[PDB]
Design a protein around this ligand. Structure first.
Ligand code: BCL
Ligand SMILES: *[C@H]1O[C@H](CO)[C@@H](O[C@@H]2O[C@@H](C)[C@H](O)[C@@H](O)[C@H]2O)[C@H](O)[C@@H]1O[C@H]1O[C@H](C(=O)O)[C@@H](O[C@H]2O[C@H](CO)[C@@H](O)[C@H](O)[C@H]2NC(C)=O)[C@H](OC(C)=O)[C@H]1OC(C)=O
Ligand code: HEC
Ligand code: HEC
Ligand code: HEC
Ligand code: HEC
Lengths: 71, 299
């Protein structure tokens, strides 16, 4: 299977691999950070018994409002 | 293919209404030809015989019968007293089966609503006024009926919402106004609906160089604001509480009653019925002590 490196130049494959792993990790971290259950920066300290479950409703927050008070 | 234009602001500001001349003539003739003509009216003496009359207490017996003929032709087609009544017993509010005559008990509320419009909202309807014909136009259902659907539906500006302003009345940013650009999109959507409801463009009520300006705007903007306040009263106090009265075929998916909006009266014209003055001919519906100096012929 090492002959894959004879048909593909490993110089080019490793850039595509690094880029693919980079976008995949970033997508998954951003997906989780936007979820209710896994917003670890705000709620990471909650125990698993008190983390959100079933919060899949597609409009959990008010769509329309003023900006927060501006100070 | 000729275009009619009306200038509504100062020279060179391009505050103008444009109409396709052919399209407008067909719309206008389509009003003229069906426009229902009024009975002549007359002046007897004598005391009122009515068994179950609760709104029209204050008009002569001839004026009452004249009003019922009008109501028939405006809502149900002419002489169709069977639409509202158990015609053997006009005083009844129920069928012989005991089941209620829902149209009659709605129509009694629609009389109070019409009087309330013509009386308390004269800053909007002035001396044109409204009759049943304005909305119904000869049919049981008016145009532009609306029901609950989504929270951000802009037609709730005509019911239970209030604020629409988004522009700051000062040069610098302030905590007074934290409106989002999304809120300006919401007002813009609302304002397109009002423009289409009258068949006008934004320059009919605004100088668009400053939408917030009242001095630069035509006076129609002040009439338009009173229209919003009128619809909130019409919807909140008269149309929406009729929910338990209608058959479920009339109700919305939330079970709510049908509500009105600008297009319900205006039907795409700058005034309802292009300004046809009918309320003056029917004192039963004035809600007002005189109509343009003509005194109410009370009993
Ligand atoms: C609450 C925690 C989150 C979560 C948070 C994160 C975060 C945050 C990250 C990952 C990352 C990854 N997650 Mg995870 N992840 C969750 C649940 C899962 C589930 C699952 C079905 O439940 C799976 C399959 C995965 C799988 C993966 C991998 C694709 C990846 C890291 C290893 C890797 O690529 O190695 C190579 C190995 C594989 C791709 C195979 C995985 C292991 C399997 C079982 C081995 C068998 C053969 C395999 C299926 C063959 C597939 C074909 C491939 C070409 C190899 N996660 C839950 C929902 N996961 C990281 C990432 O994206 O890195 C790039 C990352 O940063
Ligand atoms: C529909 O129902 C209303 C009920 O309120 C009747 O209204 C009556 O007449 C009004 C002038 C009055 O103000 C009101 O209080 C009431 O007295 C209306 O006339 C219609 O009547 C028919 O259905 C009635 C109903 O309630 O189901 C029915 O009346 C029933 O009840 C009364 C006692 O309240 C009793 O006298 C009747 O015998 C009884 N009848 C039946 C079939 O259940 C009316 O019956 C009669 C005889 O009038 C219905 O009308 C007819 C022609 O049958
Ligand atoms: C609904 C659109 C109706 C049409 C069509 C007709 N009538 Fe009517 N009628 C209607 C209401 C809402 C009322 C009550 C008014 C009030 O102030 O409460 C009435 C009342 C009458 C009466 C009085 C009966 C009584 O209580 O003694 C009469 C005599 C009457 N209406 C006659 C009448 C005629 C002749 C009609 C067609 C030509 C007619 N009505 C149509 C509602 C509606
Ligand atoms: C708009 C400002 C209207 C005025 C003026 C009048 N009516 Fe009305 N009517 C209006 C609406 C928005 C509705 C609800 C429509 C529906 O889906 O039912 C109605 C309804 C009625 C009905 C019931 C029709 C039916 O369900 O078959 C009746 C009988 C009725 N309206 C009578 C009526 C009368 C007598 C009016 C003037 C005195 C009148 N309407 C004016 C809107 C408006
Ligand atoms: C009269 C029939 C108008 C038409 C046509 C247009 N607008 Fe309007 N505008 C009108 C009124 C009565 C109001 C006040 C509404 C309220 O509830 O307070 C407004 C308001 C606006 C605003 C907000 C101004 C502010 O101070 O933030 C904007 C931005 C606005 N209108 C824009 C707008 C657009 C884009 C229009 C055509 C598509 C338009 N208006 C037409 C009256 C009328
Ligand atoms: C019937 C109950 C109506 C409702 C709903 C709305 N309007 Fe209205 N409007 C109505 C009448 C009978 C008239 C004529 C009054 C007169 O001047 O003789 C009007 C007039 C207007 C105008 C003035 C048109 C002009 O001459 O420039 C405007 C700008 C207007 N109406 C706007 C408007 C808006 C924005 C409405 C919903 C928010 C609305 N109308 C509803 C009757 C009724």
């Amino acid at each position: 299977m090492h002959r894959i490196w004879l048909m593909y130049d490993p110089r080019r494959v490793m850039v595509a691999l690094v880029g693919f792993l980079a976008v995949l990790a970033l997508v998954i971290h951003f997906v989780l950070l936007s979820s209710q259950r896994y917003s670890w920066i705000e709620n990471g300290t909650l125990g698993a018994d008190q983390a959100p479950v079933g919060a899949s409703a597609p409009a959990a927050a008010a769509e329309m409002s003023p900006l927060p008070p501006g100070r | 293919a000729a275009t009619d234009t009306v200038q509504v602001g100062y020279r060179g500001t391009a505050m103008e209404q444009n109409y396709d001349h052919g399209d407008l003539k067909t719309k206008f003739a389509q009003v003229k030809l069906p426009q229902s003509p009024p009975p002549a009216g007359e002046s007897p003496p004598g005391p009122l015989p009515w068994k179950n009359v609760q709104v029209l207490n204050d008009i002569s017996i001839a004026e009452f019968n004249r009003t019922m003929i009008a109501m028939s032709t405006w809502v149900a087609g002419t002489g169709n007293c069977a639409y509202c009544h158990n015609v053997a017993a006009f005083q009844d509010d129920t069928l012989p089966n005991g089941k209620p005559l829902y149209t009659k008990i709605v129509a009694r509320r629609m009389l109070q609503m019409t009087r309330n419009i013509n009386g308390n909202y004269s800053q909007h309807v002035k001396n044109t006024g409204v009759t049943c014909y304005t909305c119904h136009m000869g049919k049981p259902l008016p145009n532009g009926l609306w029901f609950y659907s989504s929270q951000t539906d802009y037609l709730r500006h005509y019911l239970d919402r209030d604020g629409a302003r988004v522009i700051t009345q000062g040069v610098a940013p302030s905590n007074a106004n934290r409106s989002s650009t999304k809120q300006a999109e919401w007002t813009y959507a609302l304002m397109i609906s009002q423009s289409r409801s009258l068949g006008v463009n934004c320059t009919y009520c605004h100088n668009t160089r400053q939408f917030a300006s009242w001095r630069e705007a035509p006076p129609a903007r002040v009439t338009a604001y009173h229209g919003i306040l009128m619809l909130r009263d019409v919807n909140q106090n008269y149309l929406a509480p009729l929910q338990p009265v209608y058959p479920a075929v009339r109700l919305g998916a939330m079970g709510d009653a049908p509500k009105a909006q600008c297009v319900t009266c205006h039907n795409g014209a700058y005034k309802p019925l292009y300004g046809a003055q009918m309320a003056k001919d029917f004192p039963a519906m004035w809600g007002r002590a005189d109509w343009n100096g003509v005194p109410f012929p009370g009993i």
